[PDB]
């Protein structure tokens, strides 16, 4: 059985997954999709900065979307906010 | 909270388990990192910790301002790393059409 | 020109010398992008090559609005993964010290 | 042999280790050896961001460095931007 860091480092992946598996391409998180995963996996001081502000900073390639990788930038951000936050 | 904030507090908790121990009390050294790669990654880095100088080097790559310690900020890019590398396990020689998950990393 | 332009300029000739091919000149359709990673690409996707259903879904994985296109934007998703993967294939099982760089993807 | 196009892929692996294997962790460009990157790699209209602006959007963990997957992120946008102001 996976550690529980395991589990949560796959479960980031079913987090992403409730979202880019709704339409389109498989692995892809698109304008109003980022929205939904703002509005509900993000704190306030992430939503905060907007969703679009977020798109436009997340849409490395600028093909509409964000992938996977893309979407680590956001857990990566996420992260080191919530680490700093918990210092508070 | 949500799920993904669950997520990143489990991070942050296995982090302060042991930076806390000895030394500075927010950084990993590398006898710290060690033992939280040894215990909570012994299956996404089963193969890695059989060798621990190839652990040591994964701390020397982490560890950016080279101080031989590693912050949140250098210990996530791990964390970054195997969740990609467990979501390429799940898709290793994927021919759709559909989509479908294999299991991960470390066989889970 | 300095270095990294020569490779992003190797990176667009090679996009629009399959793209200009058949149907939108800026796009690679599925015909396209197959002869791209067959010739171009032999050796970095030798073994997804083998595949042809495989080299199929990467370019589903790849077309990211989903219109059976291949733009620019999606294409270099594939070039920085190729990119990636050949740095962590030079140090793999890398135990040190100091930097080292073995031989990457189809190699 | 390679192809011209995968010669190109491990050539931009190159183009960073020459601003990384200057000083300090093999693989972290820091501030001062982005805008020795910027300077040569990138082209004109790439430079007038700012280095310390291009810093700030690449160090994705601010960790006060660039490692690899981050400065891919550079070399996505200079792709971008050169095929868009090519032709
Ligand atoms: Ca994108
Ligand atoms: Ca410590
Ligand atoms: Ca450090
Ligand atoms: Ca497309
Ligand atoms: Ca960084
Ligand atoms: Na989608
Ligand atoms: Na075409
Ligand atoms: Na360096
Ligand atoms: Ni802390
Ligand atoms: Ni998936
Ligand atoms: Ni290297």
Known sequence: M???????????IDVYHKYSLIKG??????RDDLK???????????RKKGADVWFKELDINTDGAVNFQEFLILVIKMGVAAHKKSHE | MSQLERNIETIINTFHQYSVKL???????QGEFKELVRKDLQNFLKKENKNEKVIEHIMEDLDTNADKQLSFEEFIMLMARLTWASHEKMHEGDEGPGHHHKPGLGEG
């Not at chain 1, 391409?25 to 698109?30: G, K, S």
């Not at chain 2, 030394?23 to 990993?28: I, R, W």
């Open chain 1, 36 to 46: 939904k995963l703002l509005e509900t996996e993000s704190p306030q001081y992430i």
């Open chain 2, 23 to 29: 030394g500075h009390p927010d950084t990993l050294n």
């Open chain 1, 2 to 12: 996976l550690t529980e860091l395991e589990k949560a480092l796959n479960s980031i």
């Open chain 1, 25 to 30: 391409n498989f692995h892809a998180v698109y």
